[PDB]
Amino acid sequence: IRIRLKAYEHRILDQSADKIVETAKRTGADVSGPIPLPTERSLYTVIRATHKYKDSREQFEMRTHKRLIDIVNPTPKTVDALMKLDLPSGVNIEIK
């Protein structure tokens, strides 16, 4: 089984990743990771003023930190355990 986790804050992402690994390992399944993936970054530059003044800019960035988890020899209990384990709303989780 493959679990891809994405979040805007690496701190909560690591918390959720540790929870996933802990529950899987407790269930007895083999776990590889967590594996950091190259964080995506996007940049948006906007004129600071509301009229003219092109030279004065401001730049905002959105970062998506991503973690990869691999479960091997997953026991039947692990599937329900991982589906029951609920992450914070700020973390996006994908399975297989």
């Binding site: 994405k6 804050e9 996006n92």
Partner: protein, 205 residues
């Protein structure tokens, strides 16, 4: 010279997003849904001392944490008010909405609440100096390490607009670790808009 927004400067350093959810294909739709929800909630609970709306999304659900200094007024008797609000929000959003009220202990230390109070008094034609002075008094007694307030416009209906402010303690806007709340409110008077800006520096992080 212009100054960065105090909250925007610290978002991602020590302040966290109020919209605590993640989405890729639904990002724009969720953002506009949040904006409509926030606007509707402000209009509906204007009288209630609402400060912060934290929105979370879990599949079709929407969890809305509303901070208030009048939780009883917001909740209503037997939760009637919150239940009616959930029905209205469900209609507006088209999906299940869980609502959680939060008590704003020490309301005097909330920038938006202090600014709203000052704006209400100005609309009632209180002396701007006295309004700001009493706001600072209450904030300091609440225990703010510092506070700063500013009112700008046609003070006392004067033809030439100007800005008058007050402060006490410490408001190190350039200190990034400093936990400084900020808010801007508008008081509508017979002569137009007056802008009320409040900075409240609490214990740093």
């Amino acid at each position: 010279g212009q100054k960065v927004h105090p909250i925007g400067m610290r978002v991602g350093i020590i302040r966290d997003w109020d919209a605590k959810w993640y989405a890729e294909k639904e990002y724009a739709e969720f953002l506009h849904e949040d904006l409509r929800i926030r606007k509707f909630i402000a209009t509906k609970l204007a009288d209630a001392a609402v400060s912060t709306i934290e929105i979370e999304r879990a599949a079709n659900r929407v969890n809305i944490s509303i901070h208030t200094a009048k939780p009883g007024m917001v909740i209503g008797k037997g939760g009637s008010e919150v239940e009616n609000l959930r029905k209205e929000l469900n209609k507006l959003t088209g999906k299940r909405v869980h609502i959680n009220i939060v008590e704003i202990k020490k309301p005097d230390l909330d920038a938006k609440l202090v600014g709203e109070g000052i704006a209400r008094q100005l609309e009632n034609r209180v002396a701007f100096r006295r309004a700001q002075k009493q706001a600072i008094q209450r904030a300091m007694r609440a225990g703010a390490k510092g506070i700063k307030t500013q009112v700008s416009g046609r003070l006392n209906g004067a033809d030439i607009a100007r800005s008058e402010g007050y402060s006490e303690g410490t408001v190190p806007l350039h200190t990034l670790r400093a936990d400084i709340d900020y808010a801007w409110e508008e008081a509508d008077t017979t002569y137009g808009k007056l802008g009320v800006k409040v900075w409240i520096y609490r214990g740093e992080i």
